[PDB]
Design a binder for this molecule. Sequence first.
Ligand SMILES: [Ca+2]
Length: 111
Amino acid sequence: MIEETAKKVKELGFKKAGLLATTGTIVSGVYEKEFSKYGVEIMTPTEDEQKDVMRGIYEGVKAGNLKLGRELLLKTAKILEERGAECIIAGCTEVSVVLKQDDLKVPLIDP
Ligand SMILES: [Ca+2]
């Protein structure tokens, strides 16, 4: 659950979490909402970067082009990280397929 992820992130003392998920999810703003209830901030990529996250999930992972998915998702995760994310949230299972903890400096958490 999004709310359980939020409490866990808060319990780890993190104030800023990076999010890799679908545009539908980011537009609903459900993560920012649930995380705000625990005082935690959600970091999302720019609108163009978000399009590449979408490509990474669908044109990449879901389509079978695992190389492309890894490339685009890893790059986005590394960008959120470099920007200050204390943890990266794998919002879609496709993210966890090509992105693993050994790829990041910060915790990779999935629902
Ligand atoms: Ca690895």
